């Protein structure tokens, strides 16, 4: 799920460990991090989808 | 439903000059002179009920 | 519609003057009417006028009685008909007030409509007896953690708070209000505070954002703002706190507990002086009215935690008084301080450091104290006062060779310091002050950088809350540390210190 | 009394005629709905990216 794409993130920050020239780790990192980050937010943050015709 | 609130308000003080031109009206007419009458007697039957 | 609603209301004046008692205005200067008439009238009694001012009738003279008015000079004028309300200041008191706003007079200013009153009540109710009262013993809870522990307040209690001008005194005071509404929901009324704020010459827009803040907290479902605005009038700003402390009386009569904070007396006395002096009362000193002492006593001392005889029932209170450039030997001042039972005296220097709250625990007392603290937090903070104590005089220090056990004094009381920060319109539960004040009276914090501190805490309450939310619910329930949790505690407190 | 009859009186004879939809529209905020969030192009497209990414990654430690 989303625990296993930040898992496998940090996975190669400690595989980068072994095989340095990560330059492009932080890449993959940040735009995934970013973006997953972006969309609970924005789930979370997201508006009732009707006009409210009930009270207003 | 902010210019709902605001036209209640706008209806108030539009019923209120209204009210303005009303009491030119009662001061006016002889109402003015008979209803000083019904005062007198009004007070006439309370003031006995004291 | 709105013509419907005032077709009602004017059906509903058919009243008329049956009254054997009138006055007529003879001079009208300053909002002290003098009127000749009213041969038979209740000293204090509210009176109506033509103008349909209210107005309390303070001197009562041999030709003249001299009502000062609640309304503008403008709209009265000679000769004007005083008539008798007959009755000596009251305002509606009920539950009906609790999530409203409402101006001193009992209306609502939050338009909330007619108050659910079940008695109107006189403004003036003495003091109860020494009989009447039982000593304190259930806490308050600010969830400020410094004033939880170094300052512990009880409840029908007196305790000043005395500080720095508005350098968000009433911050500190909407804090408790706020950590209040965990305990309010708790549905046993041994835990429903019902707090009442009285916003003393508080301009309307502050009082707005007051109310606003509040909303957002959803505080109103059980308090009450009295109202008293920087634009309402000296009369009604005099009687304010008066009126305010019978609301109150209500639910404390009720048998129920409740807290009422008093936000400015500072601004009380001056009121207070602007009447006396258009009464011609003999000036005194710092030229407030002589007896200015007697009003603030009388005011304070119908806050009280009473006797099962009178079933429990409190109102705890918390007066503000504001500093005037922090003169503390001021006459105002000084009389409040005697009459408190207890201070909280904040610091400028602490405010501008960025210690929020800035409360320093130096001159903070409190005389009833530990007698209603919480038995778990009483533990594990005897120490904390002492290492404070120390960090006090171990300060001066700050500035070459120092011995090692003073710079283990100074890591210890920073890294203390650091952590009874608290940001503001954020209050704790007292089962996650107590881990976090253990890991420092044990000095696990000393080694735990500055910086770190502020993240070491939020860390340390998730790790509690995964970990050790059992020890979190046994604190709770329990209230009460034993050597048994104390174990699990430190053991927990050292897996996350490691980490 | 002659209260209530001065105020009937008012009531009755004096009715208004509410404001136009118009007139409101004005002092309200009028709605644009927004529409589309737009559809971007296929990122990164052709052996382009396939080429650059084989060829490119190389840096590995020793």
């Not at chain 3, 010459?201 to 308090?223: C, I, N, P, W």
């Not at chain 3, 409190?366 to 038995?375: D, F, L, M, T």
């Not at chain 3, 002492?386 to 006090?392: G, M, S, V």
């Amino acid at each position: 799920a989303k625990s296993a794409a930040n898992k496998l993130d940090w996975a190669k920050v400690i595989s980068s460990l072994r095989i340095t020239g990560s330059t492009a780790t932080q890449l993959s990192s940040f735009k995934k991090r970013n973006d997953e980050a972006r969309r609970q937010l924005l789930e979370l943050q997201s508006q009732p989808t009707e006009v409210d015709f009930s009270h207003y | 439903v902010r210019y709902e609130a605001s036209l209640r308000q706008l209806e108030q003080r539009q019923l209120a000059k209204s009210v303005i031109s009303r009491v030119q009206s009662e001061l006016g007419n002889p109402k003015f002179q008979e209803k000083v009458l019904q005062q007198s007697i009004s007070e006439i039957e309370q003031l006995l009920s004291k | 519609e709105v013509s419907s609603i005032l077709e009602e209301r004017i059906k509903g004046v058919s009243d008329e003057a049956n009254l054997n008692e009138t006055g007529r205005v003879l001079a009208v200067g300053d909002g002290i009417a003098r009127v000749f008439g009213l041969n038979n009238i209740q000293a204090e009694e509210l009176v109506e006028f033509s103008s349909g001012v209210k107005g309390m009738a303070l001197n009562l003279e041999p030709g003249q009685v001299g009502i000062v008015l609640f309304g503008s000079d403008r709209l009265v004028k000679e000769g004007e008909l005083v008539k008798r309300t007959g009755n000596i200041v009251d305002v509606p008191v009920g539950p009906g007030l609790l999530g409203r706003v409402v101006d001193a007079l009992g209306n609502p200013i939050d338009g909330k409509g007619p108050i659910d009153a079940a008695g109107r009540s006189r403004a003036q109710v003495k003091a109860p007896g020494i009989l009447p009262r039982r000593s304190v013993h259930e806490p308050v809870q600010t969830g400020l953690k410094a004033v939880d522990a170094l300052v512990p307040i009880g409840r029908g209690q007196r305790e000043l708070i005395i500080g720095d001008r508005q350098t968000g005194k009433t911050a500190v005071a909407l804090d408790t209000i706020l950590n209040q509404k965990r305990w309010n929901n708790g549905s046993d009324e041994s835990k429903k505070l019902y707090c009442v704020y009285v916003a003393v010459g508080q301009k309307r827009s502050t009082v707005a954002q007051l109310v606003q803040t509040l909303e957002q907290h959803d505080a109103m479902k059980y308090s009450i703002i009295v109202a008293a605005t920087a634009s309402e009038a000296a009369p009604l700003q005099y009687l304010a706190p008066f009126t305010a402390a019978s609301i109150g009386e209500w639910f404390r009569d009720n048998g129920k507990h409740a807290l009422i904070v008093y936000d400015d007396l500072s601004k009380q006395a001056v009121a207070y002086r602007q009447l006396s002096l258009l009464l011609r009362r003999p000036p005194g000193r710092e030229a407030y009215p002589g007896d200015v002492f007697y009003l603030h006593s009388r005011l304070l001392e119908r806050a009280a935690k009473l006797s099962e005889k009178e079933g429990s029932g409190s109102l705890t209170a918390l007066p503000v008084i504001e500093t005037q450039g922090g003169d503390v030997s001021a006459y105002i001042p000084t009389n409040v301080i005697s009459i408190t039972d207890g201070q909280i005296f904040l610091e400028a220097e602490l405010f501008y450091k960025g210690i929020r709250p800035a409360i320093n625990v130096g001159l903070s007392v409190s005389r009833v104290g530990s007698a209603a603290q919480v038995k778990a937090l009483k533990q594990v903070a005897g120490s904390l006062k002492l290492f404070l104590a120390q960090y006090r005089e171990v300060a001066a220090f700050a500035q070459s060779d120092l011995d090692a056990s003073t710079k283990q004094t100074l890591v210890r009381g920073e890294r203390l310091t650091q952590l009874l920060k608290q940001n503001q319109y954020s209050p704790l539960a007292t089962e996650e002050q107590v881990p976090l004040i253990y890991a420092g009276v044990n000095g696990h914090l000393d080694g735990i950088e500055l910086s770190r501190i502020g993240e070491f805490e939020s860390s340390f309450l998730s790790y509690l809350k995964s970990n050790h939310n059992e020890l979190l619910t046994e604190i709770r329930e329990k209230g009460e540390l034993s050597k048994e949790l104390l174990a699990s505690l430190k053991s927990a407190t050292e897996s996350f210190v490691a980490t | 009394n002659v209260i209530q009859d001065l105020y009937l009186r008012e009531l009755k004879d004096t009715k208004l005629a509410p404001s136009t939809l118009q007139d409101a529209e004005g002092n309200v905020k009028p709605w644009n709905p927004p529409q589309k969030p737009n559809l971007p192009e296929l990122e990164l497209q052709g052996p382009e990216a396939l080429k650059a990414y084989t060829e490119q990654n190389v840096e590995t430690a020793h």
